[PDB]
Structure formats: C-alpha cells, structure tokens
Design a protein around this nucleic acid. Sequence first.
RNA 1: CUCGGUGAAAUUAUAGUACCUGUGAAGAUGCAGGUUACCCGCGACAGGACGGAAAGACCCCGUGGAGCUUUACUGCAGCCU
RNA 2: AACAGUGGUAGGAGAGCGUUCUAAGGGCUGUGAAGCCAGACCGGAAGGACUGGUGGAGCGCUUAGAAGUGAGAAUGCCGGUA
RNA 3: GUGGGUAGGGGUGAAAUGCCAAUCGAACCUGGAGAUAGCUGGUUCUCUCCGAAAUAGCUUUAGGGCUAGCCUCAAGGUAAG
RNA 4: GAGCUGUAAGCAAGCUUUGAUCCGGAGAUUUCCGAAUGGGGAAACCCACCACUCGUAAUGGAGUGGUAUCCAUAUCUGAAUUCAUAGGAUAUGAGAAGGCAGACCCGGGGAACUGAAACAUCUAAGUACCCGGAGGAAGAGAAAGCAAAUGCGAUUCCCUGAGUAGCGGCGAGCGAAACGGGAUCAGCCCAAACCAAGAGGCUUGCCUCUUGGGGUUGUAGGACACUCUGUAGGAGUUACAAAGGAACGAGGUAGAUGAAGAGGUCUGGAAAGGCCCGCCAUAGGAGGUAACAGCCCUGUAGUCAAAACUUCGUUCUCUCCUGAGUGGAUCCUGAGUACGGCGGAACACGUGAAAUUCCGUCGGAAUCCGGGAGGACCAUCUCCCAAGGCUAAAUACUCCCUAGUGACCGAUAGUGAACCAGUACCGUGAGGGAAAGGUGAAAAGCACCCCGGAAGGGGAGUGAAAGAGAUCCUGAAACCGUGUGCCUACAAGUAGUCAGAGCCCGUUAACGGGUGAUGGCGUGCCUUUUGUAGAAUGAACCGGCGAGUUACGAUCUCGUGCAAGGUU
Lengths: 51, 102, 97
Amino acid sequence: ADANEAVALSARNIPGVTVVEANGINVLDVVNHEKLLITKAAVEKVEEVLA
Amino acid sequence: MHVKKGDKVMVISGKDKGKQGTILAAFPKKDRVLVEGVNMVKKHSKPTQANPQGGISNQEAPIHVSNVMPLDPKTGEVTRVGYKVEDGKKVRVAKKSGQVLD
Amino acid sequence: FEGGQMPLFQRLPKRGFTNINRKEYAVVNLDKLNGFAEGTEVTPELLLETGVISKLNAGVKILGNGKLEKKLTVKANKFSASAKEAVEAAGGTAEVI
RNA sequence: CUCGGUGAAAUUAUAGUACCUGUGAAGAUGCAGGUUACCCGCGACAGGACGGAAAGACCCCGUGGAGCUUUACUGCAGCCU
RNA sequence: AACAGUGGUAGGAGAGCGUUCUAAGGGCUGUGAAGCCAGACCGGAAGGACUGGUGGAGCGCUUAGAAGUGAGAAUGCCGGUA
RNA sequence: GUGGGUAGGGGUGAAAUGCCAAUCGAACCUGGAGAUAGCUGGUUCUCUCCGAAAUAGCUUUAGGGCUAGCCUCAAGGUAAG
RNA sequence: GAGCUGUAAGCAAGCUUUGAUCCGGAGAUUUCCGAAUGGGGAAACCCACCACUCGUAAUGGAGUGGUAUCCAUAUCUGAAUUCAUAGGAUAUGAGAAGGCAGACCCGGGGAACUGAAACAUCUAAGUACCCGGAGGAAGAGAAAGCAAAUGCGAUUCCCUGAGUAGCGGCGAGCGAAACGGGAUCAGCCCAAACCAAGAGGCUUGCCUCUUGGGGUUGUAGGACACUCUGUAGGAGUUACAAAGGAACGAGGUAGAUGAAGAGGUCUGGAAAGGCCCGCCAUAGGAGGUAACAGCCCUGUAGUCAAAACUUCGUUCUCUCCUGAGUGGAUCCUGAGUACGGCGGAACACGUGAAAUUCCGUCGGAAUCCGGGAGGACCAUCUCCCAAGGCUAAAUACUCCCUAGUGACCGAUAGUGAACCAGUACCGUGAGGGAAAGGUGAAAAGCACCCCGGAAGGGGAGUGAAAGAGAUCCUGAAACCGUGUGCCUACAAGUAGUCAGAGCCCGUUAACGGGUGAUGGCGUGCCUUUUGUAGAAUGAACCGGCGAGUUACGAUCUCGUGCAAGGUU
Ligand SMILES: [K+]
Ligand SMILES: [K+]
Ligand SMILES: [K+]
Ligand SMILES: [K+]
Ligand SMILES: [K+]
Ligand SMILES: [K+]
Ligand SMILES: [K+]
Ligand SMILES: [K+]
Ligand SMILES: [K+]
Ligand SMILES: [K+]
Ligand SMILES: [K+]
Ligand SMILES: [K+]
Ligand SMILES: [K+]
Ligand SMILES: [K+]
Ligand SMILES: [K+]
Ligand SMILES: [K+]
Ligand SMILES: [K+]
Ligand SMILES: [K+]
Ligand SMILES: [Mg+2]
Ligand SMILES: [Mg+2]
Ligand SMILES: [Mg+2]
Ligand SMILES: [Mg+2]
Ligand SMILES: [Mg+2]
Ligand SMILES: [Mg+2]
Ligand SMILES: [Mg+2]
Ligand SMILES: [Mg+2]
Ligand SMILES: [Mg+2]
Ligand SMILES: [Mg+2]
Ligand SMILES: [Mg+2]
Ligand SMILES: [Mg+2]
Ligand SMILES: [Mg+2]
Ligand SMILES: [Mg+2]
Ligand SMILES: [Mg+2]
Ligand SMILES: [Mg+2]
Ligand SMILES: [Mg+2]
Ligand SMILES: [Mg+2]
Ligand SMILES: [Mg+2]
Ligand SMILES: [Mg+2]
Ligand SMILES: [Mg+2]
Ligand SMILES: [Mg+2]
Ligand SMILES: [Mg+2]
Ligand SMILES: [Mg+2]
Ligand SMILES: [Mg+2]
Ligand SMILES: [Mg+2]
Ligand SMILES: [Mg+2]
Ligand SMILES: [Mg+2]
Ligand SMILES: [Mg+2]
Ligand SMILES: [Mg+2]
Ligand SMILES: [Mg+2]
Ligand SMILES: [Mg+2]
Ligand SMILES: [Mg+2]
Ligand SMILES: [Mg+2]
Ligand SMILES: [Mg+2]
Ligand SMILES: [Mg+2]
Ligand SMILES: [Mg+2]
Ligand SMILES: [Mg+2]
Ligand SMILES: [Mg+2]
Ligand SMILES: [Mg+2]
C-alpha cells in the first residue's frame, strides 16, 4: 500500500521479483510478472483510484 | 592481491588444479603469480653469452592470481581472505577458521 | 500554383472585414435544457460546471431548437424570441443577466 | 627485329569476333539468305569495329551564368548647387 | 463444388520473403555457435532446410515491436585484381 | 643578382584582357553551403489483382506546370450503363 | 602494504617492512620562446645599461636582481612667458595588455546565393561573417505598465492565445501581444528641496563647488513645520553599507571493511558449461579469470574513513541601523530633456489611418492650477509619473571533471583520428588531409638437425590448434596456378536453350550427376526512346559502401477508447 522498506530491500536481490507501491502499479509490470502479490491495504488503495 | 610471495596456495583451476605450492613471485600489474611446480613450460633458448649451451629449459610460467587460494591454517582447506587489525598492524585472516594467514 | 495561369485566389476579389468587437455566444438549444430537473436555476456557471457548454465566450444565448418540457428559471445573457417564448410557455422564467 | 635482365599504359558488357547482298533506329563481326573458312602464333599495314581520348567549342534549349556596352530600367559613388 | 478469369510500361491496390536490433516465452551450442566451402533436398516467388568439410564462440526459433532493412548499372566512392 | 613595394569590385600592363605561384573576361583558400538546377544520371527483395497517357484548356508557356480527360483503391447509389 | 626503477623486452647497477614503487592534499624547483615587457629579432636567437656578487694586476669573462608602453596616485622640477601650464624626472601599484569553449550572452558593422517559378519592393536575414564587450550565465527588471473588472500589480522563461489579429509587388511570404495556466519569486539606492560643516569667487550675507545628513513618490510623495518615536531589537556582504573570525554539521579531492561452493561428477587444453547437490543475498551492478561465475579474484549492497586543501549550510561572533502620524505658507520631484519637422532604423506592422521605440540633423516644452499613455487625432474617463542607478531566482550553453545510461556504431562503420593523427603526405601560404585493429589462455615466440650466402623451407620441439609462426582469429569473390573425367584441329559461334547419342560417374535416390558429336531455335543487361541487337547511354572485373528519411503541422483511410461530447 505504502513504501515498505523491509519488503523492498528483502526482495531487491531476488531475480524476477519486483516491489511497487499501490500507486506504482503499471500494465507492463503486471503483465511481465506471473503472480501478483497484493496486500489487502493495497487492494483498497488500488480500488480507491481505479473504481 | 589476496596472496603474496611466500604464501602456500592451492591451485583451484587449470591443468594443475589440486596442486599446492609456494608463490615464488607475484606480478600485481598483471594479476599473476609464479607458483612452484605449477604451469611448467619448455623454453627453447638459443646459445647466448649468459646461457652458453642453450637447450630446452623446464621452468614455471605465471598463472592468474584468481586461480589460487591460500590454505586455512587449521583445516588445510582453501579459504577466502578477510582482514583484521591486530596490534595496530593489519593482518590477513582465513575466513574459514578465523586465524591469521600471514 | 497553376503554372503561371493567374491563380484562382488572385482572380477573385477580397471581401469584407473582421469586426474587432465581435461577440460570439455559447449557444444552448432547448433540448440541452431538458437535461436539468424542474426548479433548477440554469445559470451560465451551472451550464459550464455541468459541461453543457465547454467555454463561455461572450456569454450564453438560449436558442429555440428542440422541445422544452421543464419549468426552469433560465438565466442567460441572450435569448432568441422563440427560446424566450418556449421557456415562458412551459412555466419557466427567462431572465436576461 | 632475335636472345638474356627488368617491365608499364590508355582501353575493356561477356565474346568460339569471316565475306557478299539484303534487313533493321533508314551505314551489321553478331539479324536473314547465300558465299567462303583446318588449329596456334610471329613480322608488317591501317579499311572497319560509326576505334580511343574529352558528358560538342558549332547549333538550339534553360524564364542557367559570366564579362562587355549604351540616349534599357532602377540605383550608388564622385562632382556641382 | 460449379462457373468465369489470370500479357503488360507509367502507375494504383494487395499478400508475402529476407536483414540488424529490442521484448517476452522457449531453445541450441566446446559431444562444436556464427561465418565460410560443397552437394543430386524443400517451398508458387522472395527464400528455407539437411548432410559433410573448415571454423573455434557464440546463435537460432515463436509472437510482437523498431529500422542506417535488400544494389547490377549513378563516366558512383574505396579496396583488390585483371 | 640581392633586399624591398603594389593584392582581387584590387594590383601591374611600350595594351595581348596580357600577367598576379603549371589557376585569370576577374587568383587562391575557408565559410554562407547540402547555394540553386522546370536539366541529365542513378533509386537496391518477391508474387498476385487491376492498368493508363502521349489529349483539351490556360500558362514569359512550348522537353515544365496546373485543372479536366484516361488508371487505381475504398465506400455509397443500386441496375442507372 | 610488498614489491619496485614507465611504454619495453634485455642485461646492467640499484632501491624497499628503518615502509619503497604507487594514490590523494599542500608546497618547492620550473631552461628558452611566447602578451613577452631592457633593446633588437627571420618565435625559441642576438646585444645592452644600472646595482650587487664571483674572477683577473687590469682589460676581457661569469652569476643574481632591476630596466617596455599606457594608466592611476604622489612628490620634485617647470618652456616659449610674468605667475603659471605644457613638458620632463622620480617613487608607489597582484592597475591594464594576452589567451580561449569552434558553445551560450549583449552590442557595433553586415552579405549573397536563394525564394518570389524572370526581377527591382520584398525574401533569404539582422542569418553567415568581421569587430567590440562580457559573465558564469548574460540580457531584462520594480510601471510615465497591462487593461477596460465589485480589475491586475517588477522582470525573465514554459504552455496557450494562433498560424489568430495583422503586415504584405495584399505577391512569395512574414507574423504578434494582452488575458488565462505554470516555473520562480525580492525588492531597493539616488538626483532635487532642505540642514550642517568646510573650501574659494567675495558676485560681497550673495553665488559656486566638495564632503556628511536629509529624501525617494502618484485616488501624489518629500522638503518644511508640528507633535511622536528609536538610537540597539532588526538587518547584512546575492541588490538593499562592507570587511573578518571561530565553532558545529554535511559533501568533494586518497581510501577501509565487506556474505556465500576449488561441492561432487561428466566432457574438455582449460569448466564459469552439463547433470546431481548445497549456500549467501540491504550484495543476482560490473569487469576479470584457460568456454557462459551471486558464492575464484577485483568488486557490489550496506557500513565506515581525511593530516591537508576545498564547497555548501548553520550558529555565534562581527558589522550596520528610528519609522509612524497630522498640516497644506512656500520650496523640490531627473532640460537642450520630453516633444516636433526633416532623413533613417527598430517594432509581426514594407509610410501607411501608423500609435510605440531608437539614431543623425535642426527646432524645442510644461514643471503639480504640472506631465505621460490607452494604435492617427481631439474631448471625456481610466491607468500611470519619463528624461538617474542597482537587483538573486526561474532561462541559455558545455572545452571540461565525476558517476551512469542507450530496441546508438562495431574497423569502408563509429570522431578526420580504436593504431604515436591533425601525424604522414600535398600546398609559397591560408589551407587540404589519409591509410593503418585481432598469434596464443600463457611466449610456452620454434633448442637441435638438414638444404641454402641469405631469404625461405623440410623435420624436430612447444601448443588444444603451427594449414595459430609475427600486417600471425575467420579467410568470400575477382585474379593466378597444378592435376585430369568428358569434349575439341572442315569450323561461321550474344555462347544459351530444347532435342541427343557416346563416354565417365554414382546422389539429400531422384522418371540421378558430369561431359557433349550432332540437330532445331536464339542479336547481352541497363538507361533513354515513336522506335534501340543497336553503329545512342552506362558498367574492365570482383568485393564492400552507396538514394522517399525524420521532426513538427495538415488531411484521408483503417483501428481503439469515450460519445453530444471528446481531450488535456
Ligand atoms: K541506333
Ligand atoms: K584499322
Ligand atoms: K559450420
Ligand atoms: K559501379
Ligand atoms: K575577384
Ligand atoms: K587588368
Ligand atoms: K597557388
Ligand atoms: K479517383
Ligand atoms: K537578392
Ligand atoms: K525561379
Ligand atoms: K579464476
Ligand atoms: K510608424
Ligand atoms: K528628431
Ligand atoms: K498606466
Ligand atoms: K577516415
Ligand atoms: K581444369
Ligand atoms: K545448339
Ligand atoms: K555518341
Ligand atoms: Mg568476497
Ligand atoms: Mg626482352
Ligand atoms: Mg528490331
Ligand atoms: Mg531499310
Ligand atoms: Mg547494311
Ligand atoms: Mg548470316
Ligand atoms: Mg570515337
Ligand atoms: Mg553534352
Ligand atoms: Mg493482368
Ligand atoms: Mg492470357
Ligand atoms: Mg502502392
Ligand atoms: Mg549476427
Ligand atoms: Mg552445418
Ligand atoms: Mg541501406
Ligand atoms: Mg599562370
Ligand atoms: Mg543559405
Ligand atoms: Mg490531375
Ligand atoms: Mg527568383
Ligand atoms: Mg555575474
Ligand atoms: Mg568570471
Ligand atoms: Mg545583469
Ligand atoms: Mg553589496
Ligand atoms: Mg575486500
Ligand atoms: Mg569442483
Ligand atoms: Mg575458446
Ligand atoms: Mg523621475
Ligand atoms: Mg484609442
Ligand atoms: Mg572486418
Ligand atoms: Mg575510420
Ligand atoms: Mg612543405
Ligand atoms: Mg585452418
Ligand atoms: Mg579466439
Ligand atoms: Mg588468418
Ligand atoms: Mg573434326
Ligand atoms: Mg568442306
Ligand atoms: Mg530519336
Ligand atoms: Mg558493335
Ligand atoms: Mg545522353
Ligand atoms: Mg564505357
Ligand atoms: Mg561494383
């Protein structure tokens, strides 16, 4: 939902695992990654903007 | 370099992989070392004044420094190199055990 | 260019002038006013906010194309004769502002 | 010119590259019909290859240029007032 | 299926081939990549494989994207050699 | 002979437009500059569908151009041709 | 922190844990030429004078420093000429000079080709170019503004307005601005009245000049008077006065530390590759390493580090400093100015209906009961207060330095230049201006033998490979050769094609391959043309390179989203 430092740092070095905020979601990142791991807070934040 | 003249090292790569030996000389500018008994070449020396007879001389040729690792003093196994400050002096230490290489 | 035949534009005369003080109004026909519910004071600010008109220009003129079946207090800069009739005919009040 | 030494060039679509009469962008080694001709050179000669050389100087065209002229046009310097 | 059509310059229209690079996916490759050489293979064309030799480290394929994307002529330019 | 002077819309000329670095009806170099070229040359893979024109009018126009004519593609009208 | 005395091998002689080489900060030295400056000169040379120093008995010789011009300031002399002044002399000056980054900026001067299908107004274009001046930016800037609202409030730049308004042989073309939306924001100091003090002309209580105070503007402000009020809180070296110091913090200019596999096994010259297993990861950036490495090395993430010089910020210090009201007696508020005529230029605006701005020339105001502007002009109204100055930021550009990036190049490309290139070479000169990358992982760079004067070669050895042996990866084509399966010395040839024996082969196995006696048919390719085998054009051959692109607008088709709305 917000900029999680620990998650962003922990995932940084794993190949093929990108971390974004809710506002930083984009078509290319969604389509390029197989799985989409969203938090409940982030889903609410996405639904705020898009819906 | 991570090794120096005088160090016993294991050759970890090349034809002489597995062979231990002392570094007879180091070449920091080329990142190469001369290890005793390792990478022998047959030089075809013509008759000079310095070498009067000539002939085919068997001599060590340098290998790349990244193909050798220093031995751990405890186990005798290869080790990566760390550094600690002891008595003011910096010393190389075996990362495997902990003990001082030099 | 017509290969040296006197070009069309140049054969024909210039006509008219441009008025420095020309007013163009944002026109609104009666069919657009049907969008609003009865009792709504249709001001230029409301028309612009709702997006019935995109820009104001000199002002809002109400014109008399289409039908009106809503009692509205239409407030506008200008009205056509038929528009002012049609607003008043269906219970409304055309007000020049 | 012959032998020994050394060794360029212009040119050149590929060529196993006859002659006659004809034909054809109207003057053909190369097309047609005939006539003649074993294969490869060397010394010579220039009739042809519309031979080579140089995107014809002539001529015309370009709303191309340049130099020159004058009572062409429009200007400017200088000079006079 | 039937019927009809399919010469073509300028030129309009359509469908494709191949080249380099990128993305994603999926592969190949020191048990030998690209390139090069050869062959009597395949496709309607552009073209594409397969096998062997040379070579000695890179390269296809699929889908999409982007172009310094294709040469036989320019008295073209540079090189080489007649 | 040596040392000097004159410089390009200029110099110099016992005058030929002669000469000014194998350049002269206006030197050479660099730049404006990829000047402009209605002119000539060239313009690179394939197959299929269709397929002209070399005419009229006007044009400082006549080997250029424009509009019309003739070709092509698409969408309509539909069945006028 | 263990090697080192560069390219660059090599012998030589040495240095270095008593810390070298090497890296960074600050110093020292720094020939001669060059602005070049003691004078001269054909740059890198020559010749001086004056001090002091070395040397000689002395001359000759040598060393160090000073000695250009202009300008500023001061002092001393002071011509014709009386006082003077000009001029001269001397001293003090981190005063100027010259260069460049082929960029950006502001000025002075300023083309033409070209476009207009000719051409002169016009365009190209105030471009190129030359010249002057800069600065890190410059220029502009605090309303004699924009405008026409119950307004705005310095300038600059971006979006938009708008290819509009307009200008225009009303041709070709040229082409705004304000409003609106943003970036950034900051305002000030004088001149004058007047006051005080001093100076020199006494013009003789007047005037002029120089310092300090005072003062700073528009439904006017200030002087001047009034009563207030401050003289140290506030401000500051980026304008608003101008120097300096300390401390603290964060950067820059060297560095330090830094996790995890030689895992096993398989090919192999070598393993970073395959297969089967681990592990680290705030580190799976990158480069290297004998083939492709997060775990081999140099590193990377993270965290640290500076004696010295340096940048920024902060705080203190330091330095500097009253700002409000009420009155209209007078006084002040930028003069050869504004403005006008004439001639030009600049304004998008070409003399036009031509405001506005600037230059030359001549004429020439008002001065608060005043002046300017609102696109001729007048009136009214509105807005403003010129003829003085300063001012950061947003903006432009990149010779450089540091870090990094690319559906950018990969040796005819990419810089002209991957290499000792602005070199070689060419030119009197300005100037023009190339070609030229690849042994190998490592020199292990072929001891030795043999032919040869050598070159070169054949062995041998090294290497994974020498047909990797020095313009040494690969190694196409033209072109040049050696060998020979088929054909060829009675033949008339765009060289093929179709028919076809004979002979020789044997494949991607196909109603195969090579050759071709003989028969039929048959005038290359391209360009340009009414028409070309053409006795029209172009190409010696082979290879490489070599031509509808991109940007911004317009329009149409197709596609997609939304739809009387769509879109920023
Ligand atoms: K002909
Ligand atoms: K002849
Ligand atoms: K191959
Ligand atoms: K050619
Ligand atoms: K000249
Ligand atoms: K002359
Ligand atoms: K010359
Ligand atoms: K049409
Ligand atoms: K002109
Ligand atoms: K023209
Ligand atoms: K290694
Ligand atoms: K004017
Ligand atoms: K004047
Ligand atoms: K105003
Ligand atoms: K070059
Ligand atoms: K042969
Ligand atoms: K035949
Ligand atoms: K000819
Ligand atoms: Mg490590
Ligand atoms: Mg001879
Ligand atoms: Mg014919
Ligand atoms: Mg005839
Ligand atoms: Mg004939
Ligand atoms: Mg015949
Ligand atoms: Mg001839
Ligand atoms: Mg000719
Ligand atoms: Mg057809
Ligand atoms: Mg047919
Ligand atoms: Mg087409
Ligand atoms: Mg490739
Ligand atoms: Mg193969
Ligand atoms: Mg190309
Ligand atoms: Mg001459
Ligand atoms: Mg030009
Ligand atoms: Mg037409
Ligand atoms: Mg013209
Ligand atoms: Mg400055
Ligand atoms: Mg400066
Ligand atoms: Mg400034
Ligand atoms: Mg200041
Ligand atoms: Mg480390
Ligand atoms: Mg292992
Ligand atoms: Mg290899
Ligand atoms: Mg004033
Ligand atoms: Mg007016
Ligand atoms: Mg190459
Ligand atoms: Mg090059
Ligand atoms: Mg020379
Ligand atoms: Mg080979
Ligand atoms: Mg290699
Ligand atoms: Mg080679
Ligand atoms: Mg015979
Ligand atoms: Mg016979
Ligand atoms: Mg003809
Ligand atoms: Mg001929
Ligand atoms: Mg011709
Ligand atoms: Mg020719
Ligand atoms: Mg060629």
